[PDB]
Amino acid sequence: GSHSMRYFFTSVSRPGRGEPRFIAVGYVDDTQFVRFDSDAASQRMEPRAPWIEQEGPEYWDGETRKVKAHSQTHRVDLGTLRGYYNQSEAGSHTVQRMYGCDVGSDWRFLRGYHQYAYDGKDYIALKEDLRSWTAADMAAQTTKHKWEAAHVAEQLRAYLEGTCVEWLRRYLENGKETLQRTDAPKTHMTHHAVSDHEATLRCWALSFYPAEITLTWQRDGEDQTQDTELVETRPAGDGTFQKWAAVVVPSGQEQRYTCHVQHEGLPKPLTLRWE
Template sequence: MELSLLSLFMLGVVALTQTRAGSHSMRYFHTAMSRPELGDSQFITVGYVDDQQFVRFDSSSESQRMEPRAAWMDKMDEEEPNYWEEQTQIYRKNAQIYRRNLETLRGYYNQSQGGLHTIQRMIGCEVSAEGSLRKGFYQFAYDGHDYIALHTETLSWTAADTGAENTKRKWEPEKSIAESYKAYLEKECTHWLKKYLVMGKDVLLRTDPPSARVTRHRGPDGEVSLRCRAHGFYPAEISLMWLRDGEEQLQDTEFIETRPGGDGTFQKWAAVAMAPGQEDRYSCRVQHEALAQPLSLRWEPEASSLWVIVGVTAGVLVLVTAVVAGAVILRRRNSGGKGGAYVPAADKDSAQGSDVSLTATGEAPGALELEGG
């Protein structure tokens, strides 16, 4: 598989920033964890539209209900009166299915009773600025390793190891399983993503320009580095590039991944090392969709107010652009043990007991038992 689900779940929101500007995504992350000390398991689901978490379910919570995680989801009672009750019932059932799937996968990998194990699933879609489907995602992991994924073009399953082959042998002959998920990704997922974008447009379609500055740092051995830091921007996709004498400088450059700022915006920095006295040869270029043009920043020893000046300037540039163009810039962006996951079962008995249709409220076709064929 191209991207490890472990990375997706560890990075959370950050993993959702890898899409092109103008596109939008909706993804659900499901995690089931065994709790041997309690003789039980915990099941958690979080849903994201772009970088914003909008729903959450936790089987260990007092209410065991699907709950809103974005203010704009409070409108859902008016849009879909039965939404929250339907989602709650769906995920309570899924929690039971995942509990059984943990036992199934423990058997696949000859793991002894007890021990901490996890099943993870990521499902979702990404649409272009025009609203057409760009790609769909349907992947599973077990104990932090890839397990199995759906290839929507060929309606085939990619198994990561011999354990996952058990599931592949069960699902692949039953073409209706892959077909139902493909149909969900192409129709239901995109439909609900567009609906959520309309409901949360004030948050999801906004653009906040970055404030940025360059600082100088000296290491214990006298080495010098310049750090270019941007913060307060939305959406999360941004480019920071160091240039030396106008040429892109990748060597001796250190980047950190874009990170949530804690207030609904994001932050990022890039640092470059150099010999002392060379600082004036370097500039940092900052590109973001909320900027009318890239920012070019240099280290200025006495410019203590640069942070504020750059932020104000960026805001003015965006305002001027909006007035001249008469349009709002739309935003976007995308995402131990062996592999394992929960998925649709093909046998008649298990399908009868656990095929929960979720398409009415934007989730995928039902969670089925993970049994080998």
């Protein structure tokens, strides 16, 4: 299928003492492969997947330098934004940044992203054409005019369409044994007698990869959303994901209900029924 590489960056100012907390994570599809935490002792970009350890010391030295440079940019941005919004030095504030690229199943470039938030709200983001900017307010409009004059978009575009795609491909090849394997959901249904007249059917999808999945309930072959509950897809902790969907049904009518599971790892959707 298609693939993506994404980097997430969070920086939280610490007014009482010292510099902002900075945390960077890198992810190929739903696999975290690098991290940097300014509170950690290494002060290094660290591997989080076996296949990235194939990279030599020049890789770790250069990514460490660059992620520290990223952290300094976020540090001075927190200061710039404090002034743009006329905020005091007493308060803690947050910047968040995500960027990366998508490629299709042919590994050709699909889509690039670069978006930035301040205190949990959109600030500025590169448009899908990778040429113009979306500025949410007049502070971000000042940044937009500055970045337009310096042609920042052209630099980011060269990376998003070029460097990013080439290295995503290299990672996908080095990590083929996991990055290019799909893990279909392991499914089962459980039954819970709520009261004397109602029961809950819970349809489980376990140990799947990647995270994208669809669970639906049908009654007599028609989609049902009333009296259902779907939890957020959640990490198992071993690199796979979990989800469940439940429906409340009249006791004795369980057989009218089917759970339908769609996932990239399945040749065709699965249907589960309580019998």
